[PDB]
Amino acid sequence: AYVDVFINWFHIKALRVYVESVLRYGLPPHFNIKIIAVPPKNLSKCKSELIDAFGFLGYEPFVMYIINL
């Protein structure tokens, strides 16, 4: 289950990311869906930098998700 439920959760996360991208940037999405694994000691700084960078798309206007697993 720790593998199957995790895989299903990641599939749901990907589908939600695609839905958010098509809702925000329109159809087609053409969004650079990327996963960033920030080090634990700089999670807050990475989040702040991402928020600052997402301002050009104007919760932040850009589709952003936080996962701790």
Binding site: V17, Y18, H30, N32, I33, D52, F56
Partner: protein
């Protein structure tokens, strides 16, 4: 363990440059210009799917958010259950 204990998903449009560093590319964004220097940062190859109606898209997004919350709670419970048994961190029982 793994390289990092946290993951950040970004779905910014490809045609939009980062606000902090205008004119920067995806590599520059992944670098110190718009990141802290994450080694495992890579693109997620989400597959294509039917678009549907805009209202249908919004309903699907709400349902996906609810499902994500529920399955995150379920995964947390499963992780707690697995950590509650000492045999989880071994090769026992094949």
């Amino acid at each position: 363990l793994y390289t990092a204990n946290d993951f950040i998903l970004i779905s910014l449009p490809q045609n939009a440059q980062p606000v902090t560093a205008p004119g920067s590319k995806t590599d520059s964004w992944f670098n110190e210009t718009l990141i802290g220097g994450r080694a495992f940062v890579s693109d997620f190859k989400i597959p294509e799917f039917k678009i549907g109606s805009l209202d249908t898209l919004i309903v699907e997004s709400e349902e996906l958010s609810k499902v994500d919350n529920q399955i995150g709670a379920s995964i947390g419970k499963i992780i707690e259950i697995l950590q509650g048994l000492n045999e989880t961190s071994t090769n026992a029982y094949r």
